[PDB]
Each structure stands twice: as C-alpha cells, then as structure tokens.
C-alpha cells in the first residue's frame, strides 16, 4: 500500500495523516526513530535516505507505486488532487495558495524559537505577537465554514494544525477568536477525523523532534 515516511513524531506529517484519514486512503507508515542526546542519532533514516528513489531525499515522503513524493505541501496536494480538495473556483484556489504558504510560514516561526537554545528568552516576544497572527486567520475565515469557502480543502488541515499547535503552546490564545474555536470543533467533528483521533494510530505528540527545547516530548 501507499506509504508515508517520517520521524516517530507529529511534526510535518500531522496534516498529511489527517488528510489521508479523512480521504479514507489506504496507507502504511514507515516510522524512523531519532536517538537521544547528545548524538541525536539519525542513522535509521540516513542509512535508507538515498535508497528510496526520492529525487530530493527528505522527510516526510510519500510512496504511491511509481510516485515518490517529498515536500510536505506537495504530498498534501497529491492526495488532495485525488479527492477534489484543491479548490474549484478561482477565488478558492487563490485562498488555497495563500494559506498553503502562509501556514508553513507561521509553522516555521514556531519551530524556529522552539528549537532555539534560547527558547525561554525569545518566548515573551513571540507570545506578544501571537494574537496578531491568529487574528489574521480569524478575519480571513470570517463567517465561512471552511477557509477556501463553503467546501473543505487541504488547507483546512494545514490551518487546523497551526491553530492546534498554538492552543497547545498557549491554551488561551484562541479565546479572543470564537470563529477559530468553532473551526476546530467543526474540523475535529468530522466523522472520519473524530474516529481517527480516538484510535491507536493518532499521534498528536511529540510536537517536535528530540532536538527541540519545547515540544521535544
């Protein structure tokens, strides 16, 4: 079957796993475990990294027969394309593109400070600027059920992950934005998502790798 390869954590594979579940995809997971400190041994992956037929060897990767895909966003698009979750109208597509790139940006910013050895010192400013970021997603969604419009697309999975990672980081961060909380309920309320979250497959944490200062476990 289709196979998703990634570290034995949540990370960049989260939205992918969620999408694979929602779309009722047939897949397996090749999990790689990173060694503990001080080495943080990555040989489980490196000893196989160049033996998978990947053009740009990376994690996560998705193998679907002849198709070997890397780059998290690329994997999401590939799956989304099979289930018409890419956006149909021009307005939807524009929203999808912006979010696809916007979410990764916001994701990176969280990861940047969390892996930074000086995490505790940088945290105050990040939390200071966080409401501003969240408000943008809030205003962008508006009264829409989903981010691209009235139908769900793959970017909802990406935004869900960004919003979720933040409620975990700062529990009260979504309180000022009721529509964002409702988005989360509506998403988690999806039949196939609800079922997956209650299963043994669900892996909401560790958020980041063992090398992280926050969310490393």
Chain residues 91-120 in contact with a second copy, contact rule CB under 8 A = 93-94, 97-98, 100-102, 105
- Considering CB distances under 5 to 8 angstroms, the limit depending on partner class, which of ligand GSH, a second copy, none binds residue 5? none
**153 near 85, Cβ under 8 Å?**
yes
| DSSP-derived secondary structure for 97-116 | HHHHHHHHHHHHHHHHHHHS
**61 near 67, Cβ under 8 Å?**
no
Q: Peptide bond before 60: cis, by omega within 30 degrees of 0? A: yes
| Closest CB to a second copy among residues 140, 202 | 140
| Closest CB to ligand GSH among residues 49, 123 | 49
| Closest CB to a second copy among residues 132, 191 | 132
The answer on whether 44 is annotated among ligand-binding residues is yes
Q: How far apart are CA 142 and CA 179, in angstroms?
A: 7
Q: How far apart are CA 20 and CA 195, in angstroms?
A: 13
The answer on whether 59 is annotated among ligand-binding residues is yes
The answer on whether 101 is annotated among ligand-binding residues is no
Chain residues 39-58 in contact with ligand GSH, contact rule CB under 6 A = 49, 58
**9 near 208, Cβ under 8 Å?**
yes
| DSSP-derived secondary structure for 165-176 | HHHHHSTTTTTT
| Closest CB to a second copy among residues 147, 193 | 147
Nearest to ligand GSH by Cβ — which residue?
A: 72
Q: Peptide bond before 38: cis, by omega within 30 degrees of 0? A: yes
Binding mask 51-90 for a second copy (x = CB under 8 A): ----xx----------x-xxxxxx--xx--x--------x
Q: Which of 105, 120, 139, 175 binds ligand GSH (CB under 6 A)?
A: 105
Q: Which residues bind ligand GSH (CB under 6 A)?
A: 11-12, 49, 58-60, 71-73, 101, 105
């Amino acid at each position: 079957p289709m196979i998703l390869g990634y570290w034995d954590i949540r990370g960049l594979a989260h939205a992918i796993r969620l999408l694979l579940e929602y779309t009722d995809s047939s897949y397996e997971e090749k999990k790689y475990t990173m060694g503990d400190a001080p080495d943080y041994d990555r040989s489980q992956w490196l000893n196989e990294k160049f033996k998978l037929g990947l053009d740009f060897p990376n994690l996560p990767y998705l193998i679907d027969g002849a198709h070997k895909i890397t780059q998290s966003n690329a994997i999401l698009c590939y799956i989304a394309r099979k289930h018409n979750l890419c956006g149909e109208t021009e307005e939807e597509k524009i929203r999808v593109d912006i979010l696809e790139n916007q979410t990764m940006d916001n994701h990176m910013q969280l990861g940047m400070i969390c892996y930074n050895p000086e995490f505790e010192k940088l945290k105050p400013k990040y939390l200071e600027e966080l409401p501003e970021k969240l408000k943008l997603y809030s205003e962008f969604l508006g009264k829409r059920p989903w981010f691209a419009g009235n139908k769900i697309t793959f970017v909802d999975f990406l935004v869900y992950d960004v919003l979720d990672l933040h409620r975990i980081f700062e529990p009260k961060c979504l309180d000022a934005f009721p529509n964002l909380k409702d988005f989360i309920s509506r998403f988690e309320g999806l039949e196939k998502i609800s079922a997956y979250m209650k299963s043994s497959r669900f892996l909401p944490r560790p958020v980041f790798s063992k090398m992280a200062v926050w969310g490393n476990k």
